[PDB]
Amino acid sequence: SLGIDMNVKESVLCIRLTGELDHHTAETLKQKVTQSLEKDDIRHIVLNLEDLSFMDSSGLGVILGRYKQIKQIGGEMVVCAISPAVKRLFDMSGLFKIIRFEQSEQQALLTLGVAS
């Protein structure tokens, strides 16, 4: 069980994932890695899971891989749609700053704080 959504805004590729966040679901994004690795010019990312439940330490790294992917590309990596029982993953890892997360409110900053 897991969804997937993608949207482009000015250059920001919104990725609305709905389902689970495990090595199984984190796989889907696995492919998004190569895509984000070098899409072309310098687009933007926009992560946001509306159905964030499981989300273990499986995709945690799969998502972190992107951060160091969109950054090394020449853009920025953003992610939102956290929770009081999901942000703890990055809150405990203390690497949250490496994922720079927010809380819906980022819906705007999600655009990569670079677009409207």
mmCIF file of C-alpha atoms in Angstrom:
data_model
loop_
_atom_site.group_PDB
_atom_site.id
_atom_site.type_symbol
_atom_site.label_atom_id
_atom_site.label_comp_id
_atom_site.label_asym_id
_atom_site.label_seq_id
_atom_site.Cartn_x
_atom_site.Cartn_y
_atom_site.Cartn_z
ATOM 1 C CA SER A 1 0.000 0.000 0.000
ATOM 2 C CA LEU A 2 1.513 3.256 -1.197
ATOM 3 C CA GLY A 3 0.647 6.063 -3.584
ATOM 4 C CA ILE A 4 2.669 8.581 -5.558
ATOM 5 C CA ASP A 5 2.126 12.047 -6.980
ATOM 6 C CA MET A 6 4.288 14.457 -8.942
ATOM 7 C CA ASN A 7 3.794 18.100 -9.841
ATOM 8 C CA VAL A 8 5.987 20.741 -11.433
ATOM 9 C CA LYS A 9 5.861 24.407 -10.496
ATOM 10 C CA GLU A 10 8.199 26.842 -12.208
ATOM 11 C CA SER A 11 10.708 24.049 -11.727
ATOM 12 C CA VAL A 12 9.701 22.569 -8.392
ATOM 13 C CA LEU A 13 8.822 18.901 -8.699
ATOM 14 C CA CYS A 14 6.216 18.248 -6.035
ATOM 15 C CA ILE A 15 6.163 14.640 -4.890
ATOM 16 C CA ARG A 16 3.006 13.737 -3.008
ATOM 17 C CA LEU A 17 3.494 10.258 -1.597
ATOM 18 C CA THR A 18 0.580 8.543 0.101
ATOM 19 C CA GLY A 19 0.937 5.180 1.802
ATOM 20 C CA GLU A 20 3.884 3.767 3.712
ATOM 21 C CA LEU A 21 7.513 4.795 4.022
ATOM 22 C CA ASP A 22 9.597 1.637 4.068
ATOM 23 C CA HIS A 23 12.367 0.024 2.055
ATOM 24 C CA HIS A 24 9.409 -1.191 0.032
ATOM 25 C CA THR A 25 7.804 2.193 -0.503
ATOM 26 C CA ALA A 26 11.122 3.999 -0.268
ATOM 27 C CA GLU A 27 11.990 2.029 -3.382
ATOM 28 C CA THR A 28 9.596 3.982 -5.568
ATOM 29 C CA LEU A 29 11.554 7.098 -4.685
ATOM 30 C CA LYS A 30 14.716 5.112 -5.306
ATOM 31 C CA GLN A 31 14.090 5.738 -8.986
ATOM 32 C CA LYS A 32 13.312 9.374 -8.283
ATOM 33 C CA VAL A 33 16.931 9.477 -7.179
ATOM 34 C CA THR A 34 18.365 9.138 -10.664
ATOM 35 C CA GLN A 35 15.754 11.602 -11.862
ATOM 36 C CA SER A 36 16.710 14.111 -9.193
ATOM 37 C CA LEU A 37 20.348 13.136 -9.560
ATOM 38 C CA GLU A 38 20.319 15.040 -12.830
ATOM 39 C CA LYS A 39 16.943 15.933 -14.294
ATOM 40 C CA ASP A 40 18.445 18.536 -16.596
ATOM 41 C CA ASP A 41 18.919 22.162 -15.624
ATOM 42 C CA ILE A 42 18.175 23.046 -12.019
ATOM 43 C CA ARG A 43 14.609 22.361 -10.954
ATOM 44 C CA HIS A 44 13.175 22.277 -7.452
ATOM 45 C CA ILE A 45 11.801 19.604 -5.151
ATOM 46 C CA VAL A 46 8.606 19.589 -3.122
ATOM 47 C CA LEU A 47 8.120 16.569 -0.893
ATOM 48 C CA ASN A 48 4.964 16.156 1.152
ATOM 49 C CA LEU A 49 3.345 12.955 2.365
ATOM 50 C CA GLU A 50 -0.347 13.183 3.164
ATOM 51 C CA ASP A 51 -0.452 9.596 4.367
ATOM 52 C CA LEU A 52 2.577 9.470 6.633
ATOM 53 C CA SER A 53 2.229 6.507 8.964
ATOM 54 C CA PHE A 54 4.869 3.797 9.052
ATOM 55 C CA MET A 55 7.796 5.801 7.732
ATOM 56 C CA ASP A 56 10.647 3.994 9.444
ATOM 57 C CA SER A 57 14.392 4.187 8.930
ATOM 58 C CA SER A 58 14.009 2.647 5.495
ATOM 59 C CA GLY A 59 13.109 5.671 3.404
ATOM 60 C CA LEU A 60 14.718 7.980 5.934
ATOM 61 C CA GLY A 61 17.975 7.421 4.088
ATOM 62 C CA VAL A 62 16.298 7.186 0.704
ATOM 63 C CA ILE A 63 15.018 10.692 1.340
ATOM 64 C CA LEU A 64 18.326 11.896 2.732
ATOM 65 C CA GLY A 65 19.993 10.693 -0.447
ATOM 66 C CA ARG A 66 17.867 13.185 -2.343
ATOM 67 C CA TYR A 67 18.812 16.116 -0.142
ATOM 68 C CA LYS A 68 22.443 15.544 -1.047
ATOM 69 C CA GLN A 69 21.236 15.046 -4.599
ATOM 70 C CA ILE A 70 19.162 18.135 -5.295
ATOM 71 C CA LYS A 71 21.771 20.149 -3.435
ATOM 72 C CA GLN A 72 24.740 18.752 -5.322
ATOM 73 C CA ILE A 73 22.692 19.368 -8.443
ATOM 74 C CA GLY A 74 22.436 23.096 -7.842
ATOM 75 C CA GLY A 75 19.061 23.454 -6.168
ATOM 76 C CA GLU A 76 17.528 22.654 -2.801
ATOM 77 C CA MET A 77 15.741 19.809 -1.056
ATOM 78 C CA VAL A 78 12.587 20.370 0.959
ATOM 79 C CA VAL A 79 10.194 18.028 2.725
ATOM 80 C CA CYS A 80 7.036 18.515 4.754
ATOM 81 C CA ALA A 81 3.996 16.576 5.905
ATOM 82 C CA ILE A 82 5.695 15.543 9.126
ATOM 83 C CA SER A 83 3.943 14.636 12.356
ATOM 84 C CA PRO A 84 4.309 14.243 16.128
ATOM 85 C CA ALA A 85 4.963 10.568 15.496
ATOM 86 C CA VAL A 86 7.011 10.969 12.337
ATOM 87 C CA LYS A 87 9.229 13.972 12.958
ATOM 88 C CA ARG A 88 10.629 11.971 15.850
ATOM 89 C CA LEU A 89 12.607 9.973 13.316
ATOM 90 C CA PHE A 90 14.606 13.037 12.346
ATOM 91 C CA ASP A 91 14.261 14.558 15.795
ATOM 92 C CA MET A 92 16.075 11.583 17.274
ATOM 93 C CA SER A 93 18.556 11.252 14.434
ATOM 94 C CA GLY A 94 19.477 14.879 15.005
ATOM 95 C CA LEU A 95 20.069 15.057 11.270
ATOM 96 C CA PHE A 96 16.726 16.734 10.683
ATOM 97 C CA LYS A 97 18.701 19.801 9.672
ATOM 98 C CA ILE A 98 19.982 17.603 6.869
ATOM 99 C CA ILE A 99 16.392 17.141 5.765
ATOM 100 C CA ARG A 100 15.166 20.556 6.843
ATOM 101 C CA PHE A 101 11.569 19.629 7.570
ATOM 102 C CA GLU A 102 8.565 21.669 8.640
ATOM 103 C CA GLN A 103 4.854 21.278 9.270
ATOM 104 C CA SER A 104 2.408 21.884 6.446
ATOM 105 C CA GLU A 105 3.033 25.580 6.976
ATOM 106 C CA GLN A 106 6.037 24.825 4.801
ATOM 107 C CA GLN A 107 3.527 24.156 2.048
ATOM 108 C CA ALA A 108 4.908 27.435 0.757
ATOM 109 C CA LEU A 109 8.559 26.958 1.636
ATOM 110 C CA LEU A 110 8.068 23.469 0.260
ATOM 111 C CA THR A 111 8.297 25.023 -3.184
ATOM 112 C CA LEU A 112 11.946 25.315 -2.224
ATOM 113 C CA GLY A 113 11.599 28.824 -0.849
ATOM 114 C CA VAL A 114 12.414 29.765 -4.424
ATOM 115 C CA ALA A 115 9.201 30.371 -6.331
ATOM 116 C CA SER A 116 6.502 32.849 -5.383
#
